[PDB]
């Protein structure tokens, strides 16, 4: 519908915000650069980076950023200082008309897609582990007049070699009449593979 076009646009905006932020994780940093906290009920992701003022808006010091889904909203938090805790509290998307029903994050390590509790540390030797990219998934729903037909999450996705719905623990969706849309997108993480 009109509804699906609009919701897909929200997911795109959201992806662009998240991608630009996560591409910078590990920039010029030594120490803990990323923490992934997945669960079968959904995922959290936290990252840190060095500010050089002039190049990225948020910014000569370390910053933390985070995202997770709480009570139907994708939420975001920020902080300053080495290993600071961002506390994702501000909504990005959802929590009322739009309901964000799933957020998932996987990482690419030397050609293999993984999804597990994992910290990434940067050291003179290098990154541990070597993360080339992140995969991010969002599912969301809106009410629509007269209801919409059933949605099977993962159905509209195009997957990179090796990445699966099972790795992502993609949810079921109820036949509740809500119109659903989803997005899988990949963010390269060159600062974590260096």
User: Can the peptide bond before residue 5 be classed as cis, meaning omega within 30 degrees of 0?
Assistant: no
130 lines the binding site for its own copies (CB under 8 A): no
Residue 146 contacts its own copies per CB under 8 A: no
Token output for 75: 């939420």
Q: If phi over 0 gives left and psi between -120 and 50 gives alpha, with beta otherwise, what is residue 33? A: alpha
**Is 5 near its own copies (CB under 8 A)?**
yes
Q: Does 190 bind its own copies (CB under 8 A)?
A: yes
Give the integer Cα–Cα distance in Å for 48 and 173: 34
- What is the edge-to-edge ordering of all strands in the sheet holding 112-114? 112-114, 99-109, 131-142, 179-188
Window of 31-39, 90-98, 122-130, 168-176 that interacts with its own copies by CB under 8 A: 90-98
Min CB(38)–its own copies separation in Å: 23
Applying CB under 8 A, the span of 4-12, 107-115, 124-132, 174-182 interacting with its own copies comes to: 4-12
Nearest distance in Å: CB 158, its own copies: 18
**Segment 44 to 63, residues that bind its own copies, using CB under 8 A:** 52-57
């Amino acid at each position: 519908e009109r509804a699906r076009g609009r919701l897909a646009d929200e997911l795109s905006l959201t992806a662009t915000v998240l991608a630009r932020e996560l591409y910078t994780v590990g920039y010029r940093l030594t120490g803990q650069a990323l923490v992934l906290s997945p669960s079968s009920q959904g995922d959290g992701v936290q990252g840190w980076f060095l500010c050089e003022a002039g190049m990225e808006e948020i910014c000569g010091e370390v910053r933390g950023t985070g995202y997770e889904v709480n009570q139907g909203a994708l939420r975001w938090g920020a902080c300053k200082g080495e290993g600071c805790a961002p506390l994702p509290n501000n909504p990005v998307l959802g929590g009322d008309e739009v309901q964000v029903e799933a957020f998932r994050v996987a990482y690419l390590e030397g050609g293999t897609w993984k999804r597990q509790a994992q910290a990434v540390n940067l050291r003179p030797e290098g990154a541990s582990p070597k993360v080339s990219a992140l995969a991010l998934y969002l599912l969301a729903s809106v009410p629509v007049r007269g209801g919409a037909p059933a949605f099977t999450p993962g159905s509209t996705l195009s997957y990179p070699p090796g990445l699966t719905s099972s790795l992502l623990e993609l949810p079921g969706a109820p036949n509740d009449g809500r119109l659903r849309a989803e997005k899988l997108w990949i963010v390269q993480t060159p600062n974590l593979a260096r």
